[PDB]
Amino acid sequence: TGDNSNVVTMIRAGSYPKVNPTPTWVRAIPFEVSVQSGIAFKVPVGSLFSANFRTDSFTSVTVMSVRAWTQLTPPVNEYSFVRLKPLFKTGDSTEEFEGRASNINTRASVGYRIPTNLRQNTVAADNVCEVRSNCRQVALVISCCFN
Amino acid sequence: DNSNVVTMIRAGSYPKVNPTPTWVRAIPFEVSVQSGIAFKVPVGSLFSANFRTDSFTSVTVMSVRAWTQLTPPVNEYSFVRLKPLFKTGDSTEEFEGRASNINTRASVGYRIPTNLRQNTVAADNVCEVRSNCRQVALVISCCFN
Amino acid sequence: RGKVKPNRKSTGDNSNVVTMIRAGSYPKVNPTPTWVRAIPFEVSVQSGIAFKVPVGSLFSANFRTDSFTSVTVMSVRAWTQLTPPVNEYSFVRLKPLFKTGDSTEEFEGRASNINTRASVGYRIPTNLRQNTVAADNVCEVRSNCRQVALVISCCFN
Amino acid sequence: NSNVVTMIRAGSYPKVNPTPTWVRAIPFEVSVQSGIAFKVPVGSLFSANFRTDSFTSVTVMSVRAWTQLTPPVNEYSFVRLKPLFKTGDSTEEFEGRASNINTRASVGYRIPTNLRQNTVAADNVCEVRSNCRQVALVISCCFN
Amino acid sequence: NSNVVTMIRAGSYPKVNPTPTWVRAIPFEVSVQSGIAFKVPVGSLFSANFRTDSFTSVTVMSVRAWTQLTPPVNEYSFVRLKPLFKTGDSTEEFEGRASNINTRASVGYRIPTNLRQNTVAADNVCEVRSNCRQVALVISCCFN
Amino acid sequence: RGKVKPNRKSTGDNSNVVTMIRAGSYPKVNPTPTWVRAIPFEVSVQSGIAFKVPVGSLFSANFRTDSFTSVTVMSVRAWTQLTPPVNEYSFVRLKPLFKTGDSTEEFEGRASNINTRASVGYRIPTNLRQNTVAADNVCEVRSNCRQVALVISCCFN
Amino acid sequence: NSNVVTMIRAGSYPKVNPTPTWVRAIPFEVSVQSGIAFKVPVGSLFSANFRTDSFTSVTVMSVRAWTQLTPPVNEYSFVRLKPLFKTGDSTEEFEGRASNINTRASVGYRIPTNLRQNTVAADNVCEVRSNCRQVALVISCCFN
Amino acid sequence: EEFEGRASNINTRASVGYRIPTNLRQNTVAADNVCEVRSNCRQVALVISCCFN
RNA sequence: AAAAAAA
RNA sequence: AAAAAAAA
RNA sequence: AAAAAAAAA
RNA sequence: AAAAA
RNA sequence: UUUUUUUUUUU
RNA sequence: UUUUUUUUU
RNA sequence: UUUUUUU
RNA sequence: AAAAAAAAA
RNA sequence: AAAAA
RNA sequence: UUUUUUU
RNA sequence: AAAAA
Ligand SMILES: [Cl-]
Ligand SMILES: [Cl-]
Ligand SMILES: [Cl-]
Ligand SMILES: [Cl-]
Ligand SMILES: [Cl-]
Ligand SMILES: [Mg+2]
Ligand SMILES: [Mg+2]
């Protein structure tokens, strides 16, 4: 109804505009990490830069929120759990944001938001957070802005 | 927003995710053009690391805008023409724009109606450019997928 | 009231002589306050090579910003300061740079008249507005014109 | 709000001024002898201690004074201000006295718009009298 | 109303000024020679005859003039005023003429706020011209 | 907006320092503009004879009207400048004069007190307000008083 | 707000407290044995793992319990809670069962305001019974 | 910046304080420094409003 | 409602 | 909805 | 709400 | 919402 | 702030 | 009334 | 308005 | 109305 | 309602 | 509000 | 409706 045409139509363009071949890009990047029992795993910021995510052209990224799900079943007799400790170059946190499953067959999950005042860039050498989980793998979805 | 520290998120089930999403983009690039000769613009010029788009193999072109990128010949006013090209059938429209000041760029563009917005691959061509200026700058509004 | 007298200040904003100020307790003072500023300055650029703009350029007599050692940059605007090569329309790119991580943006503006300055700028989000010292960099500049004019909106502190 | 950089569709090159003006409250102290008036020099307003050394002229709007040290024994602090001007010094002795010996005396005065001309380092703002040996000043002024 | 004294629940010692300012209309005459302009000295404003001798500087707001003596034979009185300023004398000849020989000529002029700076005894307010030998002046001014 | 900074102009009509003016294209100027003026001057008259007032009297240092060679006269007012003969009440007549044709009007005013100036004037209709040069005349003046004061409302151009 | 530091016109020194109170939900687990009640020690709430090693007393508000491990074969998880109080233990057996063997049982109880006195590490919150060999507790309490 | 505050009674404390804008509210570890303190008084009491994490 | 045009 | 520590 | 893109009497 | 009663 | 040429679907 | 921690609907 | 992100 | 006296969230 | 058009 | 005074 | 942003 409110459609347009079935043919090409002239554009009365004007002065050459402002342009940017390499713009920013708000993204939710999904990737997994392996975790050993009882040992915290530091999540490298570098996992976010990759051709798998179309983000290999970026070197910096502003992480906004971190969410995590256990990716494999827990040990026998156990309910899946997962923890997150936010890491920041200006000072690591000591928080242990933990989510557990209520059904052994179900993923545990938890996440944390980064306040605006702590949303600085990070590079591949930097770490996002420590992860702990009685499951050997953890799936993460990181809401981050690539720039 | 007024918060100053990390806060828990009571996340739930694992979400539907997509590591290689689409991206709506305006891609600026330039092409060399010879006097009196038409130059087919390759769609492959849109897939390059310079645009963060080498990971794409297809692109739905929406609109095309061209500006003369160099001065015109002596005594002449810049001008640039576009002939949209389509795999299903090239057009014959010559959307032409002429500068009214010799020192000023000549610009023109054309929109692709929804019914012709299919994907194009690197080997495809967007449109034929013509111009008395040896280089034409192009801004192509397109959807990478 | 319960009047005294003196003075001669005629109706509010129309006094012709000095008038006493019933000042009170010594206030909170600051001899060295901050200063939000639009700093104009130029940088030289070679065709094809990036030039990292030092934050130190902002601290200078020419700007009165001498006493400062740190600055919070808000936005950066750029103009080509010189004509372009023959046959060319001016252009200028800006790549923001941060200590926590350099960006890969190339905010570019081009002139539509050869005689006219190409211009472009970019805003720094609040979450990236930390201080920067002289040794720090602001942005990479590229330009077919040999000199680029910059105006940097920042807060000195 | 925005979490990444955003382009600024800037335009023509604007009107700039690398050396803009500055309205300031400049605090500084002066030494005062008993019974002797001290001519406060305008030059004390120019100094890197205030970021104002890049200035050579200043428009004084108002002047406020507080005694900076205790008064003599048995005495309540006090301070006087006599506005001075290049076109003609005034004879007003704007006085303020403490009502608690342990507390500062203060007082100040406003300069009408018609007397707000520039002054230079050589010039004098006002005479200051006080039974206290030091007087803290805060001068509202426009550096230009 | 009250017919006896009543206590005043006074409080802390206020801000005082023994030598305050004063806005005044100062009348005084000046001797004028035929055809010759007379520079009216600002010093005539300072005098115990006006209670203003305690002042050394004064801000002039407006100046009014009247012829103080009769004019020549066959002539109507007249008076001229040319405002004088330290930053730059003016060239206006504000004139007023009597329409009845037996009556005074007058005229005056207002000083804009931006030219109301202090003046001292040495300075001159304005030139005065008149066919009458004396000119009565009334100067609205602020003594400070 | 999209802010810069500097300055210190406090609320409209209360600035204490210089403030930048974002001037633009060079305007239309005029170094020698017109000037509408009330020109006072006196003329001498003999009892019983008319005196043609020259327009040149208006161009003079004493009026700042030096640079002008032409003037459009709007209205002419006249006053007797000196006392009348013994026993007489002052009087003054004005006969307007024009290059296209002198008028035969004698606009006359008389004093009702011997001590008082007789006064009179006349307005020139728009359709007679052409320019006049020094060699031109304005009006004939008559008066039992030997000197007549004139104030001529005109436009210099 | 702004992008730079701003002065705070602070006043008199305020009332301060270096060791304030803290309202918390303390998660921790306890080992349980089949058919045997386990008394939960309040002392479990005082640990550097919870940032509460600095507290020596705590007011318990509510107690919620989940089975932390799978139940025996062919059984649905269940957990009971028997509140305990120094002034007098309760006999309530607040019990929750799982309706899906693979799902946590859960239950909890509230402590009325009149029974919310302080407890120390030696005291006991409640008895826990369960067919599961570990029970996860989350105790809402005010550390003081 | 030298945010200064003085007492108007010799027997009374001088105070002053400052706020950190949001764009400068990053974390700080023990090694870091908050602010320089100057005073003609031998001991300055401080009250720092902060967010531990 | 699409397209070429027109103030 | 509320309580506790902190800002306004 | 953020990010990229996209127009007329 | 940076800097003066 | 009411106004050409060819198509044409619903109303 | 906003930030942080916790219950309640 | 259309894409990616979070309420 | 004058004079003396007499208070809180 | 003391002192300036 | 209560005393002394006058409307 | 003569002369300044
Ligand atoms: Cl299930
Ligand atoms: Cl381009
Ligand atoms: Cl041009
Ligand atoms: Cl008064
Ligand atoms: Cl400003
Ligand atoms: Mg051209
Ligand atoms: Mg269980």
Q: Which residues pair with B10 in a beta bridge?
A: none
Q: How far is CA E36 from CA A68, E80, E127, E131, F106, in A?
A: 100, 11, 9, 9, 38
Give the separation between CA A75 and CA F109, rounded to whole angstroms.
124
The answer to the question of residue C1 being in a domain is: no
Give the separation between CA F133 and CA F125, rounded to whole angstroms.
19
Inter-chain touch D94–E57, beta carbons under 8 Å: no
Give the separation between CA G111 and CA D80, rounded to whole angstroms.
69
What would the two tokens of residue A77 be? Answer: 């007799």
Q: CA nearest A126: which of A69, A88, A92, A83?
A: A88
Give the separation between CA C136 and CA C96, rounded to whole angstroms.
12
User: Where in chain B does DSSP place strands (E)?
Assistant: 7-9, 23-32, 39-42, 59-68, 79-84, 95-98, 107-111, 119-120, 125-131, 135-144
Amino acid letter, F55: V
Q: CA nearest A81: which of A95, A70, A67, A91?
A: A70
Give the separation between CA A14 and CA B97, rounded to whole angstroms.
10
> By the 8 A CB rule, do A120 and C132 touch?
no
What would the two tokens of residue D83 be? Answer: 């506005």
Q: Which residue of D has its CA nearest to E85?
A: D87
Buried b (16+ CB within 10 A) or exposed e, G95-110: ebbbeeebbbbbbbee
H45 by Cβ neighbours in 10 Å (0-12 / 13-18 / 19+) ranks as exposed
Residue D42 phi, psi (nearest 5): -60, -25
* Domain span including residue C40: 11-157
B78 by Cβ neighbours in 10 Å (0-12 / 13-18 / 19+) ranks as buried
> By the 8 A CB rule, do C26 and H8 touch?
yes
Q: Is the CB of E17 under 7 A from strand P?
A: no
The technique is: X-ray
C-alpha C112 – ligand 2 centre gap (Å) = 12
Residues of C in contact with F14 (CB under 8 A): 13
Alpha carbons within 13 A on the beta-carbon side of C109: 24
Alpha carbons within 13 A on the beta-carbon side of H10: 12
| A60: CB partners within 8 A, 6+ apart | A121, A122, A123, A146, A147, C98, C100, C101, C102, C103, C104
C-alpha D143 – ligand 5 centre gap (Å) = 14
Report the C-alpha dihedral over residues D109, D112, D113, D117, rounded to 10 degrees: -70
Q: Which helix (H) or strand (E) holds F38?
A: strand F35-44
Q: E15 CA, R1 C1': separation in Å? A: 37
C-alpha B44 – ligand 5 centre gap (Å) = 50
The closest CB to that of F117, out of E76, E95, E102, belongs to E76
Note residues around ion ligand 4 (Cβ under 5 angstroms): C 7
Inter-chain touch D107–C79, beta carbons under 8 Å: no
Q: C2 CA, P7 C1': separation in Å? A: 23
Q: CA nearest G81: which of G71, G69, G94?
A: G94
Inter-chain touch A121–C98, beta carbons under 8 Å: yes
Looking at the 3D structure of chain G, how many domains does it have?
1
Residue nearest to nucleotide I2 (CA to C1'): A5
- DSSP at G40: E
What would the two tokens of residue E72 be? Answer: 């020549």
The closest CB to that of C114, out of B67, B71, B134, belongs to B71
Residues of C with CB under 8 A from a CB of H: 25-26, 28-34, 72, 126-131, 157
Give the closest-approach CA distance of D44 to chain H in angstroms. 18
What would the two tokens of residue F50 be? Answer: 């008319």
The answer to the question of residue C109 being in a domain is: yes
**Residue G3 maps to which CATH number?**
2.60.120.220
D85 by Cβ neighbours in 10 Å (0-12 / 13-18 / 19+) ranks as buried
| F47: CB partners within 8 A, 6+ apart | F85, F143, F144, F146
Q: How far is CA B73 from CA B39, B66, B119, B133, in A?
A: 18, 18, 37, 7
| A123: CB partners within 8 A, 6+ apart | A45, A46, A59, A60, C100, C101
Give the separation between CA E96 and CA F149, rounded to whole angstroms.
12
DSSP string, A77-141: TB--EEEEEE--TT------EEEE-SBTTS--EEEEEPPGGG--EE-TTSEEEEEEESSSEEEEE
> By the 8 A CB rule, do G125 and G63 touch?
yes
Residues of B with CB under 8 A from a CB of C: 28, 52, 67, 69-71, 101, 103-105, 107, 134, 137
Residues of B in contact with A145 (CB under 8 A): none
∠ CA F10-F12-F13, nearest 5°, is 95
C-alpha A67 – ligand 7 centre gap (Å) = 25
| C45: CB partners within 8 A, 6+ apart | C51, C141, C142, C143, C145, C146, C147, C148
| E32: CB partners within 8 A, 6+ apart | E38, E128, E129, E130, E132, E133, E134, E135
> In a 3-state reduction of DSSP, which class is residue A142?
strand
Other beta carbons less than 10 A from residue A1's beta carbon: 2
Q: Entry resolution in angstroms? A: 2.9
The widest CA-to-CA distance across chain E, in whole angstroms, is 69
Measured to protein CB atoms, the chain J nucleotides within 7 Å are 3-8
Give the separation between CA E122 and CA E111, rounded to whole angstroms.
19
Give the separation between CA A106 and CA A71, rounded to whole angstroms.
10
Alpha carbons within 13 A on the beta-carbon side of B51: 23
- Counting every residue written for chain C, the total comes to 157
The closest CB to that of A59, out of C96, C101, C106, belongs to C101
Other beta carbons less than 10 A from residue E123's beta carbon: 20
> By the 8 A CB rule, do C111 and C123 touch?
no
Residues of F in contact with C153 (CB under 8 A): 3-5
Q: Which residues pair with B25 in a beta bridge?
A: B142
> By the 8 A CB rule, do E76 and E70 touch?
no
Q: Which residue of C has its CA nearest to F14?
A: C13
Residue C136 phi, psi (nearest 5): -80, 165
- DSSP at D115: G
Q: Which residues pair with B78 in a beta bridge?
A: none
Give the separation between CA G8 and CA G2, rounded to whole angstroms.
14
Residues 56-85 of G with CB under 7 A from strand N: 61-62, 64
Inter-chain touch E99–F83, beta carbons under 8 Å: no
Q: CA nearest G104: which of G80, G133, G137, G68?
A: G68
Inter-chain touch D13–C149, beta carbons under 8 Å: yes
Inter-chain touch C119–D48, beta carbons under 8 Å: no
Interface C-E: count of C-beta contacts within 8 A:
32
F18 by Cβ neighbours in 10 Å (0-12 / 13-18 / 19+) ranks as middle
The answer to the question of residue F69 being in a domain is: yes
- Counting every residue written for chain H, the total comes to 53
Residues of G in contact with A103 (CB under 8 A): 100, 102-104
C-alpha B65 – ligand 2 centre gap (Å) = 9
Give the separation between CA D51 and CA D32, rounded to whole angstroms.
26
Give the separation between CA E8 and CA E10, rounded to whole angstroms.
5
> By the 8 A CB rule, do F98 and F121 touch?
no
Other beta carbons less than 10 A from residue C33's beta carbon: 20
Give the separation between CA C40 and CA C21, rounded to whole angstroms.
39
- Sheet of E124-130: strand order equals E38-41, E124-130, E78-83, E94-97
| B110: CB partners within 8 A, 6+ apart | A8, A9, A10, A11, B63, B64, B82, B84, B93, B95, B127
Q: Which helix (H) or strand (E) holds E27?
A: strand E22-31
Give the separation between CA B78 and CA B105, rounded to whole angstroms.
6
Give the separation between CA E49 and CA E43, rounded to whole angstroms.
12
> By the 8 A CB rule, do E79 and E68 touch?
no
Q: Which residues pair with D139 in a beta bridge?
A: D26, D63
| H12: CB partners within 8 A, 6+ apart | none
Q: Is the CB of F20 under 7 A from strand S?
A: no
Inter-chain touch H8–D136, beta carbons under 8 Å: no
Inter-chain touch C122–D7, beta carbons under 8 Å: yes
Residue to mutate among D7, D12, D15, with most F CBs inside 10 A, is D15
> In a 3-state reduction of DSSP, which class is residue E45?
helix
Give the separation between CA A44 and CA A144, rounded to whole angstroms.
14
∠ CA D12-D15-D16, nearest 5°, is 120
Give the separation between CA D105 and CA D129, rounded to whole angstroms.
12
> By the 8 A CB rule, do A23 and C108 touch?
no
Q: Which residues pair with G28 in a beta bridge?
A: G137
Q: F129 CA, M2 C1': separation in Å? A: 49
Q: Is the CB of F35 under 7 A from strand S?
A: yes
Q: Where are the alpha helices (DSSP H) in chain E?
A: none
Give the separation between CA B35 and CA A104, rounded to whole angstroms.
72
> By the 8 A CB rule, do D97 and D104 touch?
no
> By the 8 A CB rule, do A135 and A53 touch?
no
Instruction: Name the closest ligand to CA C4.
Output: 4
Inter-chain touch A91–H22, beta carbons under 8 Å: no
Give the closest-approach CA distance of B131 to chain H in angstroms. 50
Q: Name the pairing type of β-strands E108-110 and E57-67.
A: antiparallel
Give the separation between CA E83 and CA E139, rounded to whole angstroms.
12
Give the separation between CA A125 and CA A118, rounded to whole angstroms.
18
Give residue for tokens 């923001």: C96
Give residue for tokens 């907006």: F1
- Counting every residue written for chain A, the total comes to 147
Phi-psi category of residue B44: left, alpha or beta, with phi > 0 → left and psi -120 to 50 → alpha: alpha
∠ CA A137-A140-A142, nearest 5°, is 160
- DSSP at E12: S
Other beta carbons less than 10 A from residue H10's beta carbon: 12
Amino acid letter, F18: V
The answer to the question of residue C36 being in a domain is: yes
Q: G5 CA, L4 C1': separation in Å? A: 18
Q: CA nearest C155: which of F6, G141, E25, F156?
A: F6
Give the closest-approach CA distance of H15 to chain C in angstroms. 9
C94-97, Cβ contacts within 8 angstroms, sequence gap of 24 or more = C94/C120, C94/C121, C94/C122, C94/C139, C94/C140, C94/C141, C95/C50, C95/C139, C95/C140, C95/C142, C96/A147, C96/C122, C96/C124, C96/C138, C96/C139, C96/D5, C97/C52, C97/C137, C97/C138, C97/C139, C97/C140
Measured to protein CB atoms, the chain Q nucleotides within 7 Å are 2-5
